[PDB]
């Protein structure tokens, strides 16, 4: 009868960076879209 499991342990939510379609509208908004992705990843890591 050895250790079974750490109920405390939780697998971290593996984030995925959002990918935008490569059109001209993306190039004009490249910086803005990148900021949104960074915000999305930060929200996923922290939770909200």
């Amino acid at each position: 009868r050895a250790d079974e499991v750490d109920y405390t342990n939780l697998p971290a939510p593996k984030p995925q960076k959002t990918v935008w379609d490569d059109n001209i509208e993306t190039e004009v908004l490249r910086k803005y879209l990148d900021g949104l992705s960074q915000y999305d990843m930060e929200e996923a890591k922290y939770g909200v």
């Binding site: 004009v28 908004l29 803005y32 949104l36």
Partner: protein
């Protein structure tokens, strides 16, 4: 009638040359002061970002 005229005639070439050089110098200075001023305008990405924030997104 004789002397002053002769010396003026002798002066003419050097003065003409110097004045031509002076005019060339003026033109050169005029050209050298010309620089193209590239203006910088607020990037529209920040405008787009502020628009998004106003939407409460």
């Amino acid at each position: 009638d004789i002397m002053v005229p002769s010396f003026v005639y002798n002066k003419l070439p050097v003065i003409h040359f110097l004045q031509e050089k002076r005019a060339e110098q003026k033109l050169r200075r005029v050209l050298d002061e010309t620089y193209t001023e590239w203006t910088e305008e607020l990037d529209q990405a920040h405008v787009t970002d502020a628009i998004t924030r106003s939407l409460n997104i």
